[PDB]
Structures are given as structure tokens and as C-alpha cells.
Amino acid sequence: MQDAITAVINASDVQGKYLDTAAMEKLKAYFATGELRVRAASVISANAANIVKEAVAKSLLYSDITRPGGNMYTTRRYAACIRDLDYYLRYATYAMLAGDPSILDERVLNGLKETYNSLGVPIAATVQAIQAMKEVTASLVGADAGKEMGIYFDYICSGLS
């Protein structure tokens, strides 16, 4: 398992060395910014439904995707699409709290591109929907917290593409 503090600990364990000053400083930075990250994460969870609604409205709705034959034409596909965005956001916020991009790669980005390719989901459309979520999440979270959230959101998009 990987977290920001845990990854510093894991690197130190591989060395076998006692805690270095550089390791202490990096861990201190994680301790320092945890407050802003925590408050924003709570806000994200509270307004999670509104965020995915805003994202599909801004990117994935009123287009050919939701018009016939667009991989969202049916209610089953639409429900799976909003569910997929919801999972993307949930594991992304998990990782944003953790501070480490490794967690999302472990769960969200493990075979995700292959699965989407097999099912015929548009990779680009998913990426643009993720970016639209990034804008909405930045608006709700605020600039300081949203910038941190944006980095891990963008890591998810990079894994997809």
C-alpha cells in the first residue's frame, strides 16, 4: 500500500536508514497541508452529485454521445456513465486526501484503458468529462485545494490517455 507519508517511510525502509532530515521535511509538508486537503475533501463528498451533474452537462450531454448510437443512447449506458464518473471522483478524492497519486494507479488506472477499449467507450470523451469534473471540482473546492485536486484528477486523465 502507498500513501505520501507511507511512501517516504517505504523508501527509508529500503535504505534501512533512520529518518533523514529530508524525509522529515517532506513528511512535515504532508502534515502541514493536510488541513486544507481534509476540508476540501469533505466539501467534495457533500456536493458529489452536483459535480457529476455539472460535468455531464458541461461535457457529455446534449451531443451525439447521448443521442442515438453514441454509447450513452440507452439508459443502461447512461447510468453506467454517471456511475463511472462517480467512481472516478470517489477514488480521486481518496487519493487527494492521501496525497499520493499511487493509489489511483493501483485501483482506478489498473487495466482501465484496456477495459474501456474493449467495451468501446470513447477514451477522449472520458478524458474531457474528467477535465470538466476538474473545472467543477476546482470551483467548489477553491483554488488552493482545487489545484491539489487538479493534479490527481489530471493523473487519472493521463492514465486514461
Binding site: D64, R67, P68, G69, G70
Partner: protein
């Protein structure tokens, strides 16, 4: 003994039309306007 005018040979034109400027504009317009929204119709969001 040769025939100066043996027969008049048909020629295949080199320049293919529907690439010519006027038809090309019109072909673009008909295609693009068809893909766009249609005036005077009740249902337009249903169409793919």
C-alpha cells in the same frame, strides 16, 4: 494510303468536376446543412 482524319478520338477529361469551385461550395453546403439542425420540424433532438 493513310487517312489524315482517321476518326475523332474521344477524350477523358483530366479535371474531375465536383472538385470545381462552384459545385464544391454547394456540396459543402448541402452536407453541412443536412448535418445541422433542420428548420420547421417538431423533433430535432431525437435525430442522430
Amino acid at each position: 494510303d493513310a487517312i489524315v482524319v482517321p476518326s475523332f478520338a474521344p477524350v477523358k477529361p483530366r479535371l474531375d468536376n465536383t472538385k470545381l469551385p462552384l459545385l464544391s461550395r454547394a456540396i459543402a453546403e448541402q452536407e453541412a446543412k443536412a448535418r445541422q439542425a433542420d428548420p420547421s420540424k417538431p423533433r430535432f433532438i431525437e435525430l442522430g
